[PDB]
Structure formats: structure tokens, C-alpha cells
Design a binder for this molecule. Structure first.
Ligand SMILES: CCOc1cncc(-c2ccc(C(=O)NC3(c4csc(NS(=O)(=O)C5CC5)n4)CC3)nc2)n1
Ligand SMILES: CCOc1cncc(-c2ccc(C(=O)NC3(c4csc(NS(=O)(=O)C5CC5)n4)CC3)nc2)n1
Ligand SMILES: CCOc1cncc(-c2ccc(C(=O)NC3(c4csc(NS(=O)(=O)C5CC5)n4)CC3)nc2)n1
Ligand SMILES: O=c1ccn([C@@H]2O[C@H](COP(=O)(O)OP(=O)(O)OP(=O)(O)O)[C@@H](O)[C@H]2O)c(=O)[nH]1
Ligand SMILES: O=c1ccn([C@@H]2O[C@H](COP(=O)(O)OP(=O)(O)OP(=O)(O)O)[C@@H](O)[C@H]2O)c(=O)[nH]1
Ligand SMILES: O=c1ccn([C@@H]2O[C@H](COP(=O)(O)OP(=O)(O)OP(=O)(O)O)[C@@H](O)[C@H]2O)c(=O)[nH]1
Ligand SMILES: NC(=O)CC[C@H](N)C(=O)O
Ligand SMILES: NC(=O)CC[C@H](N)C(=O)O
Ligand SMILES: NC(=O)CC[C@H](N)C(=O)O
Ligand SMILES: [Mg+2]
Ligand SMILES: [Mg+2]
Ligand SMILES: [Mg+2]
Lengths: 542, 542, 542
């Protein structure tokens, strides 16, 4: 096997996941079966505990793993599906080692970080790198390991020590360390500063890893003097120092690595014998003259990474229909009448952006905060015939609103927001949390989604929810405009709803965005973009 | 005595010198006599060896110290004059300690970094902090020490160890550590990243210093969440974390520290009882509607810091006459006919900027590179009657040009550019280098500079030159338009020249820019700005 | 070329110089021409400034280098003669780099530890390793570099960084790092503790060197469990972990390395094709039943390392005549009547040891402290016919005493102890200090030393002195028992004196001990050991 370790130097937020994913898609073009592992040095077992504002969107895997968004980037660049154990955390490692100790598996000897934690990491990495994520009954050739955090993070030091050892178990032909670092330029009249990269590589060397490649992130391109200053003071050849400046799209990041010679480096060092798909999507993305204005009405809008996969799925869809996406992130609390009292400028900005909405997206979330603002946007969408996609909570709120406003059941809500709701429409219906891949079956042939999903009887989609539509109260909707077109295989759960009277007003209980790929956009997001540009009927008839 | 130690975290180029200078001018307003020390962890004894591209302009002190530009910032914010020993370097320390060892001053014991290097630093700091730079026969109250470099720089670690010890010799009431750090934001849709500041403070704590203040440099203002994240993870109270965002001028940096509570902190901690001058200059700077376009025709233009003091002296002058400065930095090699062959777009950009020149500045430099381009600009200035200031080399080149073009001595040059020049006009005339403060005497009453300098008989100005006008060949100029109005006290050196036939064509052999202050602009630069705006005759008659 | 770097872990005083020397003599037996370099991370240029109590005896080289005793160990194990530049210090490096900077040799760039100090070290090491110390007109094959200090010493970190770089300039076949560490055992009922060795190797790895060999110093032999614990936690194979327990002699240390497999390791790794001399001397040393009791009457007795080379020269001599050496170190201040008042038990112990003296040695030193005690011992030796060797000061004191007690010139002394001595017998006679190799010529055929030195006309011996016998006052001695048998080639200096009336009372102005080798004992020390055992006349007639 081959292993690539991507390390981060100065700060985490430099697109180290996109570098790792781009390295993977380059190797994939070179004919390697690629898997990926994300190491997150946090003590948390899973991302299911997190606020979105902390690390971005909680990505959901088929097995019900709640993990970091970087696992989603692997799945978008490489058409793989990952498992829980492709996320390693300090929590998982320390728990595993503790559990072994209590059984006596360490033979009455003192358990300590070296060897026992570092051995657990190596064991995990070896054994999970052998697991097929590619959908082939064949072990992959190469694992890209991303070491999340920075090389200054004390929690990460066990992992770097593990990789120091692993570099001398697996041979130097099998192990490549890539170091992603920031080169800041505080003003355009000042130089690009290399010192943080020098200092970071000195730390990395102190922990026993030598960069094979150093990936210098900057705004503007790196000057040759600055490249030589990195070469000298990081003790590395100029061929190994690559410049990843800011660009138009992720689609160009593989190409920029190709241009900077990374493909050649890997071909030489691995002994191999292209990115035309990437270049096609990249060049196409520039040439788009048309705009689709989509409103994302989201409580977590304060950091755009909180809706990363959702935005990506819109862009996949928008690219496929040759439109630019104007994604109007609207903080839903600004649409609420509270903000009309307290800060009315934000309210009339938010509602103006909602007027300019060619389509409306109401993504998921947990809690009652911002939920009245979501209901305002859904009311607007329903009545003014503006294309609507509701995901999880956005389905629940649409069903609730239709009950309130069209069935006159104004008392209707969820047992999340008001537990003692008079007519409990949206109830907790556990399996625990309905988490991971589940089979949803269509029970209405004339549904728009069935056609978009390719006239299939069932779909398998990723869920992350506790609450459901209360199956008795479905009788209220029975012969009205709002039809529950998709159910679970066990029938008692409604997982898709459509308004029959609207061009596109779709609620799905699942999260389609996790299943979205560049050359296979998630059908619900496609329908939205199509409807918003009138092209829906054309696409359906074609 | 009191000591303030300003340390830098992530990178040096964050304006740590301006922070240190602003701290000084705040304390000066609080009635303290302030001195300053710059520590430069380089092995170089002095900056006299440097290329300008390395560390910026070589600042010259009255005693003939060739030092860093940060010593010039102290002199501009605090109306002090510094000495050689206010620059400490690793070179100076190690040499001093070596010289002591050879004499036997360390009593036959093994000389090592702790104690002997760290003791030498403490000795130097104590004894030089007692030296009056303020022009008063009274020892100062407070020393601001700037530790240049970063807290990751291995050369600096001896100094940090020295200050750890010094903090326990001088008491905690006498010693304040300020830490200046970068908080980067790689995109405006991403968060402000604190991790480099956390990591830097952890290093600083590891070396035994605790920040009293942490000065977070960013582009945009720091969010309260980010301020709290610094407070928690740097283990410091929110009152100690101050935000220095980007602003219009240096004039606002003292005020921003005042607003962020630094003045209050120092008043409380030092037990003291305002910046109205700074606020006046700041608010005035914004309100300027008029523009003066000055051409700086300079070989070192590639980094603007290579002409820092010169630019500052122009801005002092421009502010005093209520004009904005458009400083057109022109790389002089672009004006040369070589670039008309090789890259003619740069040539016609450069010459266009030279057409738009309300005044021309030809600053100093060493070597023949770019010098033909300087001669092109001086020829333009002389003939088209555009206001000219030549500094050192710019005087030499003007005298050379007048000989070539007005006395027809086309063979005339310096013994620097062509040693075996037929008529050696500009010769090496050592004292070594004419370096530091020298008395220049006016020997022509009707000189423009004498009036600008306040009708004084002599001036004392800072020199840094080897080459002079050859005193025999002065006979060629004797009764022509170009008059040598200023000479040395020993007569044999001509230190100022004027064209009598021009509104303002001045050459000075000294560097007036080092003597420039905000509320006392250097007279040669004033005359340029005045001439370029027609106001010269008005100012002279007033 | 090949390079071996010997590093020390926990403490310096573990015989790291003897390891380095033993490695050299092993390679010498394998047919390699070996040179050596000692790196001393002190800021001192030379050891000429030191007190003996600080680092042991100041060893003198032929060129007049005053260096560490470890250079003397190289010369005793390897029949080489070293030069000044085979001692590298931080002082020498920083001074060289400073001197380059002042000339402008670093081309106007900022001088800093990496690269410029680390490059200076590599330059020095390369160029001095090419120098022939072996007495052959052929460059050596291998340099043993001893990095003095510990791997925790901050002064040494520049050297370790230099060797990290050098390991990647010279190839891995050319560079071997040996790490000498302490394994303490605080009680015999407690385990041998490996943690300091683990921690030291972790530091060494952090600085970018991996041990090829780890040399574990202990009292008792290392247990196999402890050897495996080192193997695991130092991340090294058991073949690389060697046990150097305490043994009878230095003669066994090469053999112990041979047994532990070091010879095999080097044969394999260097690609080579024995220590019978060492084994002969070792086994002979055990079997010695006879004892010679020698008194060393020395002011520096408090640390035996202050007379290291002197003791070694006695042992070389004693081994050659099949006697054990009882070296009675006598602090000369204890023989003085002051100690008869203040602490009379020490006095009567000291004088008892001086009664049991089969021979007396009065070694050199600087100052008047302990010098009256030396005179007491010389008086005893002269009158009671006990074999005497005086070295430098011991010659001066004998000449002084003979003047006092035999010529009745009781006022006679040196201009060192009393500058204004009435009859200044021992005067300062500079060349500076008479330092390094000088030719001494015999001017008396019937001298005992001429015969011992092999009936040669002249000898070349190592000097380190300022003071001499005053050449006018030689007239007092002219026809008496004390004859100046050896002079300088320029005649005006007397460098050897003998009493004609005594079996062996020799003063030499030089230091013969520096020239002593195991299979070539220094003749003055031989004569002492022979005289003390009656064998002198037998050896002379043979
Ligand atoms: C090393 C990183 O360096 C740099 C340097 N400069 C710029 C960027 C950069 C980072 C993020 C984005 C971004 O998110 N762009 C969008 C998109 C569409 S599809 C997708 N991601 S994706 O499906 O995983 C992938 C398989 C196709 N992203 C439109 C939303 N665009 C630019 N990154
Ligand atoms: C902690 C630093 O943080 C920040 C944050 N934001 C911005 C700046 C900033 C840095 C430099 C400059 C600058 O150089 N401005 C000019 C000027 C005129 S006079 C003078 N300097 S001076 O005479 O020493 C001083 C006594 C008056 N500078 C016009 C040339 N302007 C802004 N610095
Ligand atoms: C790695 C060190 O580990 C250990 C472990 N155990 C013991 C010793 C040990 C250290 C010093 C001594 C010592 O000094 N012994 C003497 C002697 C005679 S000759 C000479 N040195 S010599 O001439 O340089 C060399 C070429 C022959 N030394 C009698 C004075 N004896 C034992 N060293
Ligand atoms: O103010 C000062 C004084 C001294 N120095 C010293 O100058 C040397 C260079 O320190 P820099 O921070 O300029 O580093 P660099 O040139 O290697 O990297 P970048 O500019 O690309 O970030 C170091 O030895 C440092 O301590 C400064 O950086 N700044
Ligand atoms: O990709 C990943 C995975 C894990 N982690 C881990 O998350 C934790 C936070 O790491 P961050 O780099 O987010 O640090 P921070 O929030 O303290 O500071 P800034 O964002 O303001 O710079 C650390 O424990 C780190 O190892 C990441 O940073 N990123
Ligand atoms: O009192 C205690 C408690 C805990 N520990 C812990 O036990 C583990 C072993 O710590 P040791 O000091 O026993 O180290 P070791 O066995 O690797 O090496 P030597 O004995 O040969 O020197 C480490 O994780 C340490 O923190 C102790 O050493 N002692
Ligand atoms: N994924 C989501 O949007 C969660 C929605 C809702 N809180 C539930 O648990 O059903
Ligand atoms: N300061 C300068 O501009 C130097 C000018 C010239 N090289 C001299 O030494 O005279
Ligand atoms: N080497 C020594 O013993 C020095 C002796 C005396 N102080 C001299 O210099 O002559
Ligand atoms: Mg963070
Ligand atoms: Mg720099
Ligand atoms: Mg010691």
C-alpha cells in the first residue's frame, strides 16, 4: 500500500481538505483506487455533539457516522462512500486503548502514549486503509490521511509520532508527507512572509517528519524570491515547494497542483505510467453568464461552512444547467417580526433578498431558534409560487404550515418546539435517531421527484433526524394539495412531501446534499434550480 | 526605572515598531521621559552591511550608527536622538563577551549563554536605558525595548531568557511584556483565526514571559467571539487583549491604543495621574482634498520600506501644507533606454508617471545600477523646470549632469561608476565614510535652503557617504547657474548645491529625512512640496 | 570521507572522550587513517583562560593550542598530533562569522544561525577533516567528531542542526551518529533506569539525528530487559544498543566495544575487510603484583582530571616496568605550616604520604598558592635522596630552592610570586607565552635525560610558560651540583636541570606528559618510575 499524510502548519482553515481531495483525484486519474482517512485530534468521538458554528456542517455517512465536512470533500472529489472508522479521533483511540487495558490485552504492562496509543493509530490506519470505500471488492492502493489541526496542536503530537514510526514500517517509497502552510501578506506593499512556514517545518522536523511537498497557500501568487526563501529555510528543493494561490473554483485546484508539478512528482516517486473532467467543469464555470438567485434561509448563516454540502449541491446543479448561483444566505431570525422592532434595516434587507428569490431553500437544523423565520419564507414560497426545497426541518415546517394555513389547524406544531402541542403533528419517532442510509419508497407515480430520480421505485438517502410526521394526523392531508409521495419501507414514516398545486414545492426528510457529486447532482436540488429558471418541464419532458 | 518589552509572535512585518513607538508617545503624554532600545537578533553588528531589500532603509544616527528603520520610528514619534548602543544585536553581545573572555574578565570559568550572554544583555539594557536621548541632563523614567524578529527565532531565545531573569531583578511593577500577534483571515467568508496567537503565547510562556497586553493585528476589526477565544486560550483577561485593525495613518495608532484601554492600563499599573496633537494630525490627514504628485525615482522601489524615512518626510511636509501625497515610486532602470528595447510598456508607464510629476525626488543609493535612469529624470527636471530634490547620490548626479550638459564636459562622472573617469568630478574623499552628524555652513546668503532652514548660518545634518565633489573642478561651475551654496566647516567639501535659474533644483549631500519629524518637517522636502504647489514664494515671503 | 559524530545525552562526565578515542583506535586497526575534532559549545576561544577545576587539564598542542583534555585522549589512543582548528568552539565560529560580516562576505544579507553559523561549522569540519594529523602526506579517511556537552545544552543546538544538514550532504553511508547516555542505578536493590536515555534520544531525534549506536554507560552490566526497554523506547534495534559497564582500565574499552559488536557494525556499514596491542596492555595491567608509590604534590588535587595527562604518563611508565601505580595525590597547601596550625590531621596525613613516597612528582601550575608546600616536598626529595621529577613550576622551584638552601641566596624567588624579589632568579622572559613545541638542545653529554631520550642531541617538547631562569644568575650554579643540562636553541633559556649528586632529581621546563603514549612513555616519567624501583641503572646499562 501507499500512504500520503497531509499536515497543516499555521492554521486549519486554508483548504487542507481540498488539497487532500485534489491529491486523491489526481491519483484516481493515474488509475489508483484511493481511500481516505481524516484524523481529528479532538477528544470528541463523533461530530454529532457539535454546533455547526464550531467545525462547519456535520456530514453524515451511510452507516450513520456523524463526521467532519472534510469527509464530504473526499466523497465529492472521489466517488467513494466512507465508514465511521475513516474518521479517527483522539477520543476513539483513547477509548479503544482504555477498553483493551480493562480486558488485560496489554498483558499487565503500563499503558502509555508511546507505544500503545501510537500502535493503536497505526493498527487503525493499516486496517481501515485496506477497506474498500470505492464500491469494488478489491483493497485500495493508496490512503490519503489528513491530519486535521495544526502541527502546534498538542493533541495531534501522538499522531505525528505514530506517523514517524509508520514511515519506518512502511518504507519511504510508501510514505509521503505533504505540508500545507500559510504565507501571509498583511499589505500588498509589504512582502509575502515565509517565517510561519519555516517555523512550522522546523516543528514538523522536530517531530520526525520531513516534507516531500510543501504547499504554500497565499492570496496572490508566490514570488520566486519567496519560493527560494522557503526552499533554503525549510531545507527542501524548489521542485517540492508549490504555490496554491486563490482561484475561481475548487475545480482548478487539481489543475494548479498538476501545473506546479505534483502529478509528475507522484508519477516519478510511485513509478506510474487526464484531469479533463476537472478542466471542463472549471472552464465551464467561468463562462456562465446567466444567474439563478437562490435564497438559503438558514439560522447558521453566520458561517457559510454550516451549510457547505448544501451550497455544493446547489453549485453542482447550477453548473449542470449553465447558470451562476447567487446564493443569498438569509439569517432566518431577521425575517421574524422581533427584528422588525429591534433592527428593521436587517428585516427589510432579508425580505428584499427573499423578494429577489428565484428559488428558496430551507435547510435543516435543530431547535426553535430561527424557525418562525423559516415559516415566513415557506409561507411566501407557497403563496407566491416561488420554487421551494425543504430539507428535514424544512419538510416538517412545510407540513406544519399547510396544517396551520390550509387545513386551519393553527395549533399545529412539533413536540420539539412545544412538547405539549394540542395537535402534535411532528412527533419524536425513534428507531435512537434515524441516522444514515435508509430506503425511501415512492407511493405516488405522478411525483416530480420520482421522475428527477430517474423513475426509480425507491431511493436510498442519508437521514439524520428524530422527529417525524405523526401517522394518524396524515388523515387531515389525505385528499388535499399536500401529498406525502415518499414513505419508508415500513410505511409508518413519511419521508417526502410535495404540493401538487405548485411548480416545485418539495419537502424531503432526508439530506440529499450528502449524496451530491459534480457530475451527478442531487435530484431535489436540480429540480429547484430548473424550476427557478423555468427549465423543469423541458428537463422532465427530455 | 520602568521597562516595556514589545515581542512579536507570528511575523515581524505587522508594525511592531509602530506599536512600540505609539506606546512611547502615550507614556510621553503621561509626562514620562522615554528612551528606546531595539534588539535585532541578527549576528550583524550594524545595518551598514545590508541591502535595503533585506530589512528596509538603513537609518543613520548622529554618532554614525547605521541601524534599522525602527530606530527612526522612535525618533519620529518621540523627539529623541539615539546612540549606537540603543541598537543591541547578537553580534554586539557575542563580540563583547568574547573580548571579555580573552582579557580573563570571566575569572577562568566557562563562558556560556546563561549566564554570560544573558548578563551582558541585562547590563547593556540597564546602562543604556539610563542614557539621555531626550536632550535633557536627566536619566529617563522608562525604556521601551522592542525584541525584533519572532518568538520562534532561535537567535532571539537568549534575549527572552535575559528578560525572564530581568523580570525578577526589576520587579513586576517595573516590567511589562506586550505581545504583538497576527490574526489572519484568509477569506472574508471564513473566520478570523486565533491559533497562531495561542501557539505564540504558549511559546512565550515556555520561555518564561507572560503577556501583560496582547495586541492582535488584523485587517478588519476583531469580533467579540474571537477576542474571547484569545482570552481563554492565551490565558489572559479580555481587558488585556486589544484589537489594532487597519486604519488610514500611523497618527491613529496611538488613539486606537487609547480607545482599546492601553493608556488606562499603564496609568493604573504605573500609578500615574492628551494625544490631541496626534488626533489633530490624524483628522487633518483625512480632510485633505488637494493632491501633490511627487515622483520618487529610486532603484530600491521594489520594497517601499527601502525609502521609508524619505516617504515619511514627504508626508510630514505634505500634511503641513494640507495636500495628500501621490508618491509615484518609479524604478529608475525602467526610464533607461535598455527597457525601451526589452520591455517598452514599463518604460512608457515610468515616463508617463514622470510627466505627471509636480515634483521629482532622486534619493540616495550605492552603485551604478539605475543611475542612468536617475540622470534621465534629473535632465527632465532641469529643462522642464519641474521641482527637484536630490539627496546624496542625487546631488552627485546633478553636478555630473550640469558638467555634462551645461559645461559640455560629457566625459564627467564619478570614480565609483568608472574609477578611471577622464575628468573625475565625484571622487572618494574619506575622513573612512563621512557618517553621522556634521556641520554644514552656508556660503551664499541668497540660497533658498538658508531661508527654509530659518536663516541660520549653519545646519547640522546626518551624512552617510564616501564620495564628494572634487574641489579643483569646482572652478568649472564658478560663475554658472549651478552654485555650491553649502560647504563643510573645513571648506574642502561641497554639501549643498542649487540651480539659481530654477524654482527649486536642490542637491544636498546629507540625508535630511532622518531629521524629519511630524511637527517639524525637514526643510528640503518642504521646499519641494511647496514648489510643486506654487506656495514656495508665499511661504518664503511669510 | 567518513564522519562519526559522538553525542552525549545526560551528563558529559561519562567517558564520551574515551568512547570516541576507542572508536578511533578500532577504525585505525581496520586500516583507516583517522583524524578527530572536538566541538566544545563554550564561548571561550581556547582553554588557556581556564582554571583546571573547570574542565580538567589544559592540553597543549604543538602549534601552541591550549585545548581540552579530550584532544589529549585522541593523541594517546591514536598516534596523531592535532592542530588548533581540531578544536571548534562557539566562540571561534561566532567570531569567524562576525569577521566575515564586517568584510561584507555575506553579500549584504542578514546573518543568522541557520544558515551562516551552521555553514561555518560544516565548512570547518570538512576542511579540517581533510588535514593530516597522522604524520602522512595523505588526507585521512575518517573524522571522529565529539560533540562535547549534552544534547540539552542550548549552545550545542547549532552544532546538532549543522550535523542534521551535513547528514544530507555527506550521505548516510558517510555519517554515523553515536549517542552515549547514562543508565543510573541509585541502589543495587532498585532497577537500572532507562528514562534519561529515552528522553535524550527523543531530544536528539527532535534535532534531526537518529542514533546508529546507543552506548549505555552504567556501573554494573545492563540486564537484557533493560536493553530491550532501551531498544523499544529509543526506537532502535538491540544490535545498536551496547553496554559499557565499569572496568579495570581504558585498555579494555576498545575490547568491550569489540565484544558488544561495534567493530562488526563498522565493518558491515563501511564495507571493510586486531586490538591485540590493547588486549596485551589490558591483561598485563591486571597481572601486576608490584607497587610503586608516587607522590603527586599538586594544588589542583581536588579534581584528579587537573593532572590527567601527568597521571596517564605515570601509568604508561609504570605498565612498561610491570608495576602498579599508587598515585598519592597530595594537596600541597596541606604540607605548609599554616595547616599545622589550622588542621594538623591533614598535615600529618600529607607528610605521611610524602614519607611513603618511592618517588615525588611536582607538576606545573600558575600562582603562589600551594607553592611553599611544593618547596617542602622538593626539600624532602633533595635531602632524603627520593627520586624527583619537577615539571615547569617544579623546575623553577627546584632552582629557587637550590639557590636558597645550597647557594645560601635565601632571598631568591620568582618575579611571579614576589615581583620585587631582591635577586630575581625566575623572571618573565616572553617570546608572549612560550607555548607549543620548541627544540631543546642538550649541552651536557653525561645527563641522565639524554640517555633516557635515546642519546639524541636535541628533543622537541611542548612548552606552556612565561617565566624562565634569569641567564645572568646562572653564574651562581656554574660549578655546583645543580647543572643546567638542556637549553633552548637560542641558548638564553635553560629548559632542563639535574642534580648530579642525586639518583634522579630532574627539572624540565616543558610538559613531557603531552607527548606520552602507551607504547612510548615519556622518558622523564620513565626515569622517575625506574629510579623509584632501583631499575634506573639497569635500564640505562641495557
Ligand atoms: C486548497 C484550496 O485553495 C483554494 C484556492 N482558491 C480558491 C479555493 C476555493 C475553495 C472553495 C471553493 C468552493 O467551495 N467553490 C464551490 C464549489 C462547487 S463544487 C465544490 N466543491 S466539491 O464538490 O467538493 C469539488 C469537487 C468539486 N465547490 C462553488 C462552491 N471555491 C474556491 N481554494
Ligand atoms: C501597528 C500598525 O498598525 C497599523 C494599522 N493600520 C495602518 C497602519 C499604517 C502603517 C504605516 C503607515 C504610514 O507609514 N503612513 C504614513 C506616515 C506619515 S508620518 C508616518 N510615520 S511617522 O512619522 O513615524 C509617525 C509619527 C507620525 N507615517 C503616510 C506614510 N500608515 C498606516 N498601521
Ligand atoms: C567509556 C569509559 O568507560 C569506562 C568504564 N570503566 C572504566 C573506565 C576508565 C576510565 C579511565 C581510566 C584511566 O584513566 N585509567 C588509567 C590509564 C592508563 S593509560 C590511560 N589512558 S590513555 O593513555 O588515554 C589510553 C590509551 C590508553 N588511562 C590508569 C589511569 N580507567 C578506566 N572507563
Ligand atoms: O525587527 C527586526 C530585527 C531583526 N530581525 C531578524 O531578521 C532575521 C529575519 O527575520 P524575518 O522575520 O524577516 O524572516 P525571513 O526573512 O527569514 O522570512 P520572511 O521575511 O519571509 O517572513 C531574523 O534573524 C530576525 O530575528 C527581524 O526580523 N526584524
Ligand atoms: O480539520 C480539523 C480537525 C480537527 N481540528 C481540531 O479542532 C480543534 C480546534 O482547532 P482550530 O484550528 O479550529 O483552533 P481554535 O478554534 O482554537 O482557533 P481558530 O479557529 O480561531 O484559529 C483542535 O483540537 C484541532 O486539532 C481542527 O482544527 N481541524
Ligand atoms: O509514580 C509513578 C506513576 C506513574 N509513572 C508512569 O509510569 C510510566 C513509566 O515511567 P518510568 O519512570 O518507570 O519509565 P520506564 O519504565 O519507561 O523507564 P525506567 O523505569 O527504566 O527508567 C510512565 O508513563 C510514567 O509517567 C511512573 O513512572 N511513576
Ligand atoms: N436534520 C435536521 O434538520 C433535524 C430536524 C429535527 N430537529 C429532527 O431531529 O427531526
Ligand atoms: N548615501 C548615498 O546615496 C551614497 C552615495 C555614494 N555612493 C557615496 O558614498 O557618496
Ligand atoms: N606551566 C606552568 O607550570 C606555569 C609556570 C609559570 N607560571 C610560568 O609561566 O613559567
Ligand atoms: Mg477554530
Ligand atoms: Mg524577512
Ligand atoms: Mg561541569
Amino acid at each position: 500500500m501507499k500512504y500520503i499524510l497531509v499536515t497543516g502548519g499555521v492554521i486549519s482553515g486554508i483548504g487542507k481538505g481540498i488539497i487532500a481531495s485534489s491529491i486523491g483525484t489526481i491519483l484516481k486519474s493515474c488509475g489508483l483506487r484511493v481511500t481516505a482517512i481524516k484524523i481529528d485530534p479532538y477528544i470528541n468521538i463523533d461530530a454529532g455533539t457539535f454546533s455547526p458554528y464550531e467545525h462547519g456542517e456535520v456530514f453524515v455517512l451511510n452507516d450513520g457516522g456523524e463526521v467532519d465536512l472534510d469527509l464530504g470533500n473526499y466523497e465529492r472529489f472521489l466517488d467513494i462512500n466512507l465508514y465511521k472508522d475513516n474518521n479517527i479521533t483522539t477520543g476513539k483511540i483513547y477509548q479503544h486503548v482504555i477498553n483493551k487495558e480493562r480486558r488485560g490485552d496489554y498483558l499487565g504492562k503500563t499503558v502509555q502514549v508511546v507505544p500503545h496509543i501510537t500502535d493503536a493509530i497505526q493498527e487503525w490506519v493499516m486496517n481501515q486503509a485496506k477497506v474498500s470505500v470505492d464500491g469494488n471488492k478489491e483493497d485500495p492502493q493508496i490512503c490519503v490521511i489528513e491530519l486535521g489541526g495544526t502541527i502546534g496542536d498538542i493533541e495531534g503530537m501522538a499522531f505525528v509520532e505514530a506517523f514517524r514510526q509508520f514511515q519506518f514500517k512502511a518504507k519511504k517509497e510508501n510514505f509521503y508527507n505533504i505540508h500545507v502552510s500559510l504565507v501571509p501578506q498583511p499589505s500588498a506593499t509589504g512582502e509575502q512572509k515565509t517565517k510561519p512556514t519555516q517555523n512550522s517545518v522546523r516543528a514538523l522536523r522536530g517531530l520526525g517528519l520531513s516534507p516531500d511537498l510543501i504547499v504554500c497557500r497565499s492570496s496572490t501568487p508566490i514570488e520566486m524570491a519567496v519560493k527560494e526563501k522557503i526552499s533554503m529555510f525549510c531545507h527542501v528543493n524548489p521542485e517540492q515547494v508549490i504555490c496554491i494561490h486563490d482561484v475561481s473554483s475548487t475545480y482548478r485546484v487539481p489543475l494548479l497542483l498538476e501545473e506546479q508539478g505534483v502529478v509528475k512528482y507522484f508519477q516519478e516517486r510511485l513509478g506510474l505510467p487526464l484531469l479533463f473532467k476537472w478542466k471542463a467543469m472549471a472552464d465551464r464555470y467561468e463562462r456562465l453568464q446567466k444567474i439563478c438567485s437562490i435564497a438559503l434561509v438558514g439560522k447558521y448563516t453566520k458561517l457559510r461552512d454550516c451549510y457547505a454540502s448544501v451550497f455544493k449541491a446547489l453549485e453542482h446543479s447550477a453548473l449542470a444547467i449553465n447558470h451562476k448561483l447567487n446564493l443569498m444566505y438569509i439569517d432566518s431570525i431577521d425575517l421574524e417580526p422581533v427584528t422588525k422592532a429591534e433592527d428593521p434595516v436587517k428585516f427589510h434587507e432579508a425580505w428584499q433578498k427573499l423578494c429577489l428569490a428565484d428559488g428558496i431553500l430551507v435547510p435543516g437544523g435543530f431547535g426553535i431558534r430561527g424557525t418562525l423565520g423559516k415559516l415566513q419564507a415557506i409561507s411566501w414560497a407557497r403563496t407566491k409560487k416561488i420554487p421551494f426545497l425543504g430539507i428535514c426541518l424544512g419538510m416538517q415546517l412545510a407540513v406544519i404550515e399547510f396544517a396551520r394555513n390550509c387545513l386551519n389547524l393553527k395549533d399545529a406544531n412539533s413536540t420539539e418546539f412545544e412538547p405539549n402541542t394540542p395537535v402534535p403533528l411532528v412527533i419524536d419517532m425513534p428507531e435512537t435517531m434515524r441516522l444514515g442510509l435508509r430506503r425511501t419508497v415512492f407511493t405516488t407515480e405522478n411525483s416530480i421527484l420520482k421522475k428527477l430520480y430517474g423513475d426509480v421505485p425507491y431511493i436510498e438517502e442519508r437521514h439524520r433526524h428524530r422527529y417525524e410526521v405523526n401517522p394518524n394526523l396524515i388523515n387531515q392531508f389525505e385528499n388535499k394539495d399536500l401529498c406525502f409521495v415518499g414513505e419508508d419501507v415500513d410505511g409508518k414514516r413519511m419521508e417526502i412531501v410535495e404540493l401538487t398545486s405548485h411548480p416545485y414545492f418539495i419537502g424531503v426528510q432526508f439530506h440529499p446534499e450528502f449524496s451530491s457529486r459534480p457530475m451527478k447532482p442531487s435530484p431535489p436540488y436540480l429540480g429547484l434550480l430548473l424550476a427557478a429558471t423555468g427549465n423543469l418541464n423541458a428537463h422532465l419532458q427530455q
